[PDB]
């Protein structure tokens, strides 16, 4: 009618993509934007967003490389295997990782045209409630109109501005997976699942890794398991600086001089910041429409309907506040919105009992409620916990037939196990059913 | 005062163990026998039964050894890991395996007395409805009386008697996990999940294996997958002799000349039989009490309640007919019987939806009815199938909301995936649930 496109998505990640290929799968004409702003270290990559280029894919691949070395050094010789001169080539791992990422970048290209979604390689910005201005990447504007707009820009790794040298001298998850030079003696700053996973496979590869955590590691997860992971990581050679953080970074002849709140200065080889990520919003001119944005984390504020502060606009994925930063949790929410918008669907997003799996030296799969968080919502009185690397932790409700609220496992292949249990939780499994299984 | 014991258990395997302890855990005077008759190659072992000494445990340890290699060969180098002079010491592996097996041997021993279950290391024989005779291990016979008697003697590998030289020249699973000398060029006769697993890890270790099958592999599971597993094993270097079996085995300078039905005669270093296992009942004197036994496999015929024709005697584990040969399936079955007997329990053993995992080169975990099993039971119009190393087979009912009845996954970690999804099936999952997951 009087709109260039019915569906104008901003961001080519799993979410934005997942929704586009869905809106076009129901007739609607969809225009999709995706442009990778270079990292703080000038690193760039192809179409696919975070998960593919600097997330799940490269992360898991790296992990595997680290797990091999771990298997060789711990078990290999005990199981009758004999080998000589065991060494690891960093550049070989990267070339393999980056090679695979590129074969996906192309695999996703030939995917858009197949779904017939007009893809433009340019960074977009909000011109008007129904209009989207953009720059094709030289900068000359080009405007477009759409019946509905989706914001799926996700987030980008956060680096502190108050810390002198941090921004310029350190790297992030954005750079590590395509890093040319050897990581060398590495300092990892943060306690996220990313921070521990990175310092996790770096240590397994045989690097001098050191993690600086302000307070706790894996905040948001069950802390009885979090502590077991940290202890294990410490036994494997990962050293933690508890309560100490970098105050300033200085260059010293191809080495980084890090000064901690400790007043202690230990010069490292590579500094990696993984203190969290904040939504990529600053370039979307949102103040011009007074959108509901969370200042703390820079995310769009979205109701479960996925509707924004403005009726015309929507938000899905890592940009939405309180929405778990997972590839799958982002794909579905995008699928549903497409049906809500173009198939007159009545289904709404389900954010409960989604399983996450941290790929640390010792894996930690989690689905449902933490123990402590289950106490806040239901109280110790009404919450019962059971144990049942063969450790498993089941958190269930006292008052309603010990129905399982949460499930946590710190063991080999936790990712695999937790995924199955996740479906059992949705079917409202109960301890009764477990012991009798 | 009537009998010497309240409970007399013949068999020290998983089933016998689990039961005796559960019986003693509720106030019953329990006597338990266990005596490992030497293999056809004179191989003997400590207390714990099959799973521990010549089953699950060792099998899994061996597989893991082979798996390492497979990682070295296939993936190691691609991930930046370099090394020299890769070799495998068979002896080192057995000493590691056997060491662990012995650590368990002692664990269980100290466990029984810890649960106060009078244990005799003698092989038993039925004297009458509630009297058991046994011989210490010259001979003397000691009788003992019991209110309830349980037989849990499991099975032992089968070697054909019609084939000349087989019994004397060839080996079985009883032998391999403690084999002094190298297996060398190995011929594995049979297609059982044991048959494939063994030839699998032997192959992964780097031996010249050869599997002679009658017709099909893994009869009883979903053939669609059984074909995948065979194909993959072939690509990995396993040679299958289809529809060709040995008709005679001859000795020759430390090698064995195997003459096949093919009219072809080739020579191997080691010939392993895994064509199936038959219940160890022959020496129980059961035919004295006209027991109901399945003639083809020498198994006791069991009640849903684990009852024989003789109400004073019960049967559990692997000796019972149509009872799946899994360590867990024998424990739960042996623990219910105990409660049933000594704690007036009204509970019955459920056999449906029990998960198995085949540790072949490519793992294949299964749970629920097979595709052919489903059809014959429910009908093709009634049943629909859905397919997801990333592919899973779902066999669900058309008529009742596509409730899953069979889950088959051939992948990296089938065991884990199958285990989890197993519980889901018991909760009566639907394809509708899976799609939503
Ligand atoms: C190291 C790491 C490991 C992870 N591992 C896992 C895992 O194992 N499993 C899991 O489920 N999740 C994992 N995640 C999280 C997962 O990657 C994200 O939650 C998922 O990618 C969400 O995608 P999204 O569409 O919401 O945002 P994104 O995937 O980040 O997509 C946003 C895209 O839009 C583009 N863009 C941004 N701004 C603009 C603009 N204004 N104009 C045009 N284009 C723009 C960006 O280039 C970006 O590529 C991991 C994350 C990280 C960092
Ligand atoms: C190679 C192999 C691999 C396997 N892997 C797995 C697996 O991975 N997972 C799984 O769940 N299951 C596995 N199984 C099956 C599992 O081992 C059995 O199903 C389980 O051990 C059942 O034990 P049971 O107590 O019923 O009998 P058994 O374990 O065989 O116990 C019977 C015991 O009684 C003793 N006995 C026999 N006669 C007498 C006598 N008259 N007097 C005194 N004692 C006697 C025998 O010496 C024997 O030790 C495997 C089996 C094999 C052969």
From Swiss-Prot, chains A, B:
Gene: TRXR
PANTHER family for this protein: GLUTATHIONE REDUCTASE
Assembly: Homodimer.
Bridged cysteine pairs (disulfide): 51-56
Keywords: Cytoplasm, Disulfide bond, FAD, Flavoprotein, NADP, Oxidoreductase, Redox-active center
GO CC, alphabetical: cytosol; mitochondrion
Chain residues that bind FAD: 14-15, 34-37, 50-51, 55-59, 124, 318, 325-327
NCBIfam families, per the entry: TGR
Pfam families according to UniProt: Pyr_redox_2, Pyr_redox_dim
Cofactor: binding comment: Binds 1 FAD per subunit.
Name the UniProt record assigns to this protein: Thioredoxin reductase
Compartmental location: Cytoplasm
Family statement drawn from the similarity comment of this UniProt entry: Belongs to the class-I pyridine nucleotide-disulfide oxidoreductase family.
Claim: Nucleus is one of the keywords in the record: no
Catalytic activity: [thioredoxin]-dithiol + NADP(+) = [thioredoxin]-disulfide + NADPH + H(+)
E.C. no: 1.8.1.9
Function of the molecule: Catalyzes the transfer of electrons from NADPH to thioredoxins TRX1, TRX2 and TRX3, which in turn act as reductants of disulfide containing proteins. Able to reduce nitroglutathione (GSNO), a compound involved in the transport of nitric oxide (NO); however, TRX1 is more efficient in reducing GSNO. Has no catalytic activity towards oxidized glutathione (GSSG).
Single GO MF annotation: flavin adenine dinucleotide binding
Any one Gene Ontology BP term: cell redox homeostasis
Superkingdom, taxonomy of origin: Eukaryota
Cofactor(s) of this protein: FAD
UniProt keyword NADP present: yes
Miscellaneous comment as given in the Swiss-Prot or TrEMBL entry: There are 2 isoforms resulting from alternative translation initiation. The displayed sequence is likely to represent the shorter isoform.
């Amino acid at each position: 009618h009087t709109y260039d496109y019915d569906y104008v998505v901003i961001g080519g990640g799993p979410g934005g993509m997942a929704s586009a290929k869905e809106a076009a799968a129901h007739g609607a004409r969809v225009l999709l934007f995706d442009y990778v702003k270079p990292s703080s270290q000038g690193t760039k990559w192809g179409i696919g967003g975070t998960c593919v280029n600097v997330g799940c894919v490269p992360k898991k691949l790296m992990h595997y490389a680290g797990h091999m070395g771990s298997i060789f050094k711990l078990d290999s010789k005990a199981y009758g295997w004999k080998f000589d001169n065991l060494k690891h080539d960093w550049k070989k791992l990267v070339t393999t990782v980056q090679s695979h990422i590129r074969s996906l970048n192309f695999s996703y290209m030939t995917g858009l045209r197949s779904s017939k979604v007009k893809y433009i390689n340019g960074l977009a910005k909000l011109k008007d409630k129904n209009t989207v201005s953009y720059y094709l990447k030289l900068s000359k504007e080009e405007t477009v109109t759409g019946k509905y707009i989706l914001i799926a820009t996700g987030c980008r790794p956060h680096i502190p501005d108050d810390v002198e040298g941090a921004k310029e001298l350190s790297i992030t998850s954005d750079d590590i997976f395509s890093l040319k030079k050897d990581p060398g003696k590495t300092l990892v700053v943060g306690a996220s699942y990313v921070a521990l996973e990175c310092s996790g496979f770096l240590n397994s590869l045989g690097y001098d890794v050191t993690v600086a955590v302000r307070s706790i590691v894996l905040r948001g997860f069950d802390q009885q398991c979090a502590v077991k992971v940290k202890l294990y990581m410490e036994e494997q050679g990962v050293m933690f600086k508890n309560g100490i953080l970098p105050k300033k970074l200085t260059k010293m002849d191809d080495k980084i001089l890090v000064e901690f709140s400790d007043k202690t200065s230990e010069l490292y080889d590579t500094v990696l910041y993984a203190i969290g990520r904040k939504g990529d919003i600053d370039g979307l001119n949102l103040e011009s429409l007074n959108m509901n944005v969370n200042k703390s984390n820079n995310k769009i504020i979205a109701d479960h309907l996925s509707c924004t502060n403005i009726p015309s606009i929507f938000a899905v994925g890592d940009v939405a506040e309180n929405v778990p930063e997972l590839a799958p949790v982002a794909i579905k929410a995008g699928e549903i919105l497409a049906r809500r918008l173009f198939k007159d669907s009545d289904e709404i997003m389900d954010y409960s009992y989604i399983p996450t799996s941290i790929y640390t030296p010792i894996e930690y799969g989690a689905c449902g409620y933490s123990e402590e968080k289950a106490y806040e919502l239901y109280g110790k009185s009404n919450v019962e916990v059971f144990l049942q690397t063969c450790l498993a932790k089941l958190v269930c409700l006292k008052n309603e037939d010990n129905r399982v609220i949460g499930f946590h496992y710190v063991g080999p292949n936790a990712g695999e196990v937790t995924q199955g249990m996740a479906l059992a939780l949705r079917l409202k499994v109960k301890k009764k059913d477990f012991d009798n299984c």
